[PDB]
Design an enzyme around this catalytic site. Sequence first.
Site, PDB file in Angstrom:
ATOM      1  N   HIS A  16       0.800  -1.230  -0.099  1.00 37.26           N
ATOM      2  CA  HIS A  16      -0.100   0.059  -0.147  1.00 37.26           C
ATOM      3  C   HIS A  16       0.694   1.300   0.028  1.00 37.26           C
ATOM      4  CE1 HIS A  16      -3.296  -2.787   0.477  1.00 37.26           C
ATOM      5  NE2 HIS A  16      -2.751  -3.294   1.469  1.00 37.26           N
ATOM      6  N   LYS A  39      -3.671 -10.521  -7.243  1.00 41.57           N
ATOM      7  CA  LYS A  39      -4.497  -9.886  -6.298  1.00 41.57           C
ATOM      8  C   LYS A  39      -5.731  -9.199  -7.052  1.00 41.57           C
ATOM      9  CE  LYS A  39      -4.400  -7.317  -1.910  1.00 41.57           C
ATOM     10  NZ  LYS A  39      -3.685  -6.232  -1.247  1.00 41.57           N
ATOM     11  N   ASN A  40      -6.962  -9.358  -6.620  1.00 44.96           N
ATOM     12  CA  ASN A  40      -8.053  -8.815  -7.408  1.00 44.96           C
ATOM     13  C   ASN A  40      -8.138  -7.261  -7.196  1.00 44.96           C
ATOM     14  OD1 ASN A  40     -11.418  -8.708  -7.841  1.00 44.96           O
ATOM     15  ND2 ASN A  40     -10.195  -9.930  -9.279  1.00 44.96           N
ATOM     16  N   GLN A  41      -7.618  -6.703  -6.332  1.00 47.93           N
ATOM     17  CA  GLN A  41      -7.928  -5.462  -5.811  1.00 47.93           C
ATOM     18  C   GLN A  41      -6.807  -4.941  -4.927  1.00 47.93           C
ATOM     19  OE1 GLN A  41     -12.205  -2.824  -5.494  1.00 47.93           O
ATOM     20  NE2 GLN A  41     -12.110  -5.145  -6.378  1.00 47.93           N
ATOM     21  N   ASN A  42      -6.320  -3.789  -5.126  1.00 50.80           N
ATOM     22  CA  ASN A  42      -5.233  -3.267  -4.158  1.00 50.80           C
ATOM     23  C   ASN A  42      -5.257  -1.807  -4.097  1.00 50.80           C
ATOM     24  OD1 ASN A  42      -2.896  -3.925  -2.226  1.00 50.80           O
ATOM     25  ND2 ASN A  42      -1.982  -2.553  -3.889  1.00 50.80           N
ATOM     26  N   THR A  43      -5.030  -0.968  -3.042  1.00 52.31           N
ATOM     27  CA  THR A  43      -5.128   0.299  -2.862  1.00 52.31           C
ATOM     28  C   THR A  43      -3.656   0.854  -2.394  1.00 52.31           C
ATOM     29  OG1 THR A  43      -7.370   0.528  -2.343  1.00 52.31           O
ATOM     30  CG2 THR A  43      -5.748   2.504  -1.869  1.00 52.31           C
ATOM     31  N   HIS A 130      -2.187  -3.669   8.290  1.00 54.23           N
ATOM     32  CA  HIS A 130      -3.529  -4.065   7.284  1.00 54.23           C
ATOM     33  C   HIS A 130      -4.008  -2.931   6.838  1.00 54.23           C
ATOM     34  CE1 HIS A 130      -3.274  -8.390   7.406  1.00 54.23           C
ATOM     35  NE2 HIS A 130      -3.440  -8.344   8.821  1.00 54.23           N
TER      36      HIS A 130
HETATM   37  N1  LIG Z   1     -11.332  -1.433  -1.988  1.00 56.81           N
HETATM   38  C1  LIG Z   1     -11.417  -2.776  -2.008  1.00 56.81           C
HETATM   39  N2  LIG Z   1     -12.710  -3.323  -2.064  1.00 56.81           N
HETATM   40  C2  LIG Z   1     -13.179  -4.692  -2.068  1.00 56.81           C
HETATM   41  N3  LIG Z   1     -11.921  -5.629  -1.918  1.00 56.81           N
HETATM   42  C3  LIG Z   1     -10.944  -4.983  -1.769  1.00 56.81           C
HETATM   43  C4  LIG Z   1     -10.409  -3.672  -1.655  1.00 56.81           C
HETATM   44  N4  LIG Z   1      -9.019  -3.641  -1.712  1.00 56.81           N
HETATM   45  C5  LIG Z   1      -8.650  -4.903  -1.423  1.00 56.81           C
HETATM   46  N5  LIG Z   1      -9.681  -5.867  -1.366  1.00 56.81           N
HETATM   47  C6  LIG Z   1      -9.538  -7.179  -1.393  1.00 56.81           C
HETATM   48  O1  LIG Z   1      -9.531  -7.566   0.284  1.00 56.81           O
HETATM   49  C7  LIG Z   1      -8.360  -8.834   0.107  1.00 56.81           C
HETATM   50  C8  LIG Z   1      -7.355  -8.130   1.157  1.00 56.81           C
HETATM   51  O2  LIG Z   1      -6.857  -6.865   0.585  1.00 56.81           O
HETATM   52  P1  LIG Z   1      -6.461  -5.772   1.711  1.00 56.81           P
HETATM   53  O3  LIG Z   1      -7.960  -4.996   1.847  1.00 56.81           O
HETATM   54  O4  LIG Z   1      -5.402  -4.874   0.623  1.00 56.81           O
HETATM   55  O5  LIG Z   1      -5.641  -6.150   2.809  1.00 56.81           O
HETATM   56  P2  LIG Z   1      -4.372  -5.936   3.347  1.00 56.81           P
HETATM   57  O6  LIG Z   1      -3.856  -4.730   3.816  1.00 56.81           O
HETATM   58  O7  LIG Z   1      -4.394  -7.091   4.914  1.00 56.81           O
HETATM   59  O8  LIG Z   1      -3.420  -6.948   2.667  1.00 56.81           O
HETATM   60  C9  LIG Z   1      -7.928  -9.019  -1.149  1.00 56.81           C
HETATM   61  O9  LIG Z   1      -8.455 -10.292  -1.827  1.00 56.81           O
HETATM   62  C10 LIG Z   1      -8.067  -7.740  -2.017  1.00 56.81           C
HETATM   63  O10 LIG Z   1      -8.212  -8.305  -3.278  1.00 56.81           O
END
Ligand SMILES: Nc1ncnc2c1ncn2[C@@H]1O[C@H](COP(=O)(O)OP(=O)(O)O)[C@@H](O)[C@H]1O
EC number: 4.6.1.18
Length: 135
Positions: A16, A39-43, A130
């Site tokens: 992140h 990973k499907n989604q990541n910010t 996280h």
């Molecule tokens: N904005 C979002 N909306 C929905 N699902 C998300 C989003 N960001 C991440 N995810 C999903 O949530 C799961 C954990 O990712 P994340 O939220 O980045 O947690 P972490 O910081 O613990 O890695 C992954 O499957 C990811 O694809």
Amino acid sequence: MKPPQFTWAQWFETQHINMTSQQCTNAMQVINNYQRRCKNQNTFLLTTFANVVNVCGNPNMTCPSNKTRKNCHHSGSQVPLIHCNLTTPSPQNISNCRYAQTPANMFYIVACDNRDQRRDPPQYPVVPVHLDRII
Ligand SMILES: Nc1ncnc2c1ncn2[C@@H]1O[C@H](COP(=O)(O)OP(=O)(O)O)[C@@H](O)[C@H]1O
């Protein structure tokens, strides 16, 4: 999941904070090559690690993503962020995963914990582990 060579804080930084390219497809290769899956989604928060460590100092609040947890903290200030979305899933080969990028300015809520005693640098007793939510 998390590769064995990273502490949760180091993996948080890798996922992140250190967006290695302003392009999601390239930035995500780092994360995906490490966790062996796209990973499907990541910010990616366009802020510094130190800035987040300080947000860990804001009041404790319930984690929107895991209601049983109280180790979350709200940023109190919106920040620029890039959200990556998998557009081209490729389980048979992860370097072929493509992503879309969505810019935004929002608040972030992070879960923080005491540092990994053995592997985390002593400079930061408390670290983000996280990204619980962007609001
Ligand atoms: N904005 C979002 N909306 C929905 N699902 C998300 C989003 N960001 C991440 N995810 C999903 O949530 C799961 C954990 O990712 P994340 O939220 O980045 O947690 P972490 O910081 O613990 O890695 C992954 O499957 C990811 O694809």
